[PDB]
C-alpha cells in the first residue's frame, strides 16, 4: 500500500555521476549513485522519490510503453537478505519511487545506498552537446552537466555517389512478453545523388541462428518519411513522425516492399535525392538469444551506370542493471 511521501524525512548524500560524458550510439551510459539517511522512523508504505531531468532517462532503449510506462527495479535489501524497500520507475514522469516494506516497522534510523543506470533521452537530447542534468532526490537538487557525443548517423562510402545508410534500435520491449522493438533507419543521410537505390532491413546480421529479431509482413511495420532539411535530423536517431520536417510517403511504396526472403525487408527506393527516415516496428522471438540487426543499402551512379556501391550497418543493444541496499536497527 503506497502511502505517505516522506521526502522531508530522507536526505541524500555523496552524489556522483559515474561519468559525465559518453556516446549513447556506442552503448554509452552512466550511473547515478548516492547514500541516503532517514532522519527519524518510517513504516510500511512510506516512500521517497528521485526525479530525472529532460536530458536523461532511466530506462534507455528498453521500451516500457506496453507495460504502463512502469519499469520494476531490483529490491533494496538488508545484509541478511530481507527486502527493505521495493523500487519502481515511471518513464513518463521520470520518477523513481522507493516504498518501504514492513521490515522498517520495528527498525529505526535507516541508512542506505543505491546505484541506478542512466541513459540518454534521444528525443529531448537529440543532438550531440552539453546538457544540464540536475537530478532530484528527496526534494533536494543535485546539479550535474552531462555531455552526449553521438557517433554521427551520417555515415557511408566516401564517394559522391557512395551508398550511405544508418540505423539504431531505440526501443525494446522486454517486459510485456509482447517482444516488440522500435528502430529508426536513416536512408541516405549524406543526401548525395543516388541511382537505382535499394534498402534491406534484416533482423539477424550474418547468422540467422544468432539474432532473435523477426522480419516479415506479419511481425514488421514500416513507415517512410521524405526529409526536407537533413540539417535538422537528430544525432540520437530519434525521429518524430509528426515533425513537419518529415513527410510520410508510405502510400507511395505499395509495390516496392518485399518480405519474401528470410528475415529481411526489401525497399526499392529507386532514383532518390533526399534523406529518408524509415520507422520500424518489429518483433523478436522467445529464443532468448540477443536481438541483432543489419541494414544494407546498395546503389549505382545515376550519371554513369557503373560505379556500384554497397554499405551495411549493424545494431545490437546492451543491458545495464540497478543496485541498492539499506539497513536499520533490530529493535
Amino acid at each position: 500500500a503506497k502511502g505517505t511521501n516522506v521526502n522531508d524525512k530522507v536526505t541524500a548524500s555523496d552524489f556522483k555521476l559515474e561519468k559525465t560524458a559518453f556516446d549513447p550510439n556506442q552503448s554509452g551510459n552512466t550511473f547515478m549513485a548516492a547514500n541516503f539517511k532517514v532522519t527519524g522512523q518510517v513504516k510500511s508504505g512510506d516512500y521517497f522519490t528521485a526525479k530525472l531531468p529532460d536530458s536523461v532517462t532511466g530506462n534507455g532503449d528498453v521500451d516500457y510503453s506496453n507495460s504502463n510506462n512502469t519499469m520494476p527495479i531490483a529490491d533494496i535489501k538488508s545484509t541478511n537478505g530481507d527486502v527493505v524497500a521495493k523500487a519502481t520507475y515511471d518513464i513518463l514522469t521520470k520518477t523513481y519511487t522507493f516504498v518501504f516494506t514492513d521490515y522498517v516497522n520495528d527498525k529505526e534510523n535507516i541508512n542506505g545506498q543505491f546505484s541506478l543506470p542512466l541513459f540518454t533521452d534521444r528525443a529531448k537530447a537529440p543532438k550531440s552537446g552539453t546538457y544540464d542534468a540536475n537530478i532530484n532526490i528527496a526534494d533536494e537538487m543535485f546539479d550535474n552537466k552531462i555531455t552526449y557525443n553521438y557517433s554521427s548517423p551520417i555515415a557511408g562510402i566516401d564517394k559522391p555517389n557512395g551508398a550511405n545508410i544508418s540505423s539504431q534500435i531505440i526501443g525494446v520491449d522486454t517486459a510485456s512478453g509482447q517482444n516488440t522493438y522500435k528502430q529508426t533507419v536513416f536512408v541516405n543521410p549524406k543526401q548525395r545523388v543516388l541511382g537505382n537505390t535499394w534498402v534491406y532491413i534484416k533482423g539477424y546480421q550474418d547468422k540467422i541462428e544468432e539474432s532473435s529479431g523477426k522480419v516479415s509482413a506479419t511481425d514488421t511495420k514500416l513507415r517512410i518519411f521524405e526529409v526536407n532539411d537533413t540539417s535538422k535530423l537528430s544525432d540520437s536517431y530519434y525521429a518524430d513522425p509528426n515533425d513537419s520536417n518529415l513527410k510520410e510517403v508510405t502510400g507511395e511504396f505499395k509495390d516496392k516492399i518485399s518480405y519474401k526472403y528470410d528475415n529481411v525487408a526489401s525497399i526499392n527506393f529507386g532514383d532518390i535525392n533526399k534523406t529518408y527516415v524509415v520507422l520500424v516496428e518489429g518483433h523478436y522471438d522467445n529464443t532468448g538469444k540477443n536481438l541483432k540487426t543489419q541494414v544494407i543499402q546498395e546503389n549505382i551512379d545515376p550519371a554513369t551506370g557503373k560505379d556500384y556501391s554497397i554499405f551495411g550497418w549493424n545494431n545490437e543493444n546492451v543491458v545495464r542493471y540497478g543496485g541498492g541496499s539499506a539497513d536499520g536497527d533490530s529493535a
Binding site: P24, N25, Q26, S27, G28, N29, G58, N59, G60, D61, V62, M71, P72, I73, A74, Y89, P117, F119, S151, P153, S166, S167, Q168, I169, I170, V172, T174, A175, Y237, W313, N314, N315, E316, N317, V318, V319, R320, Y321, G322
Partner: peptide, 11 residues
C-alpha cells in the same frame, strides 16, 4: 568487432 544502444530491465 556500426551503432549500438543501452537500456535497463530493472530485473
Amino acid at each position: 568487432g556500426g551503432s549500438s544502444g543501452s537500456g535497463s530491465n530493472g530485473d
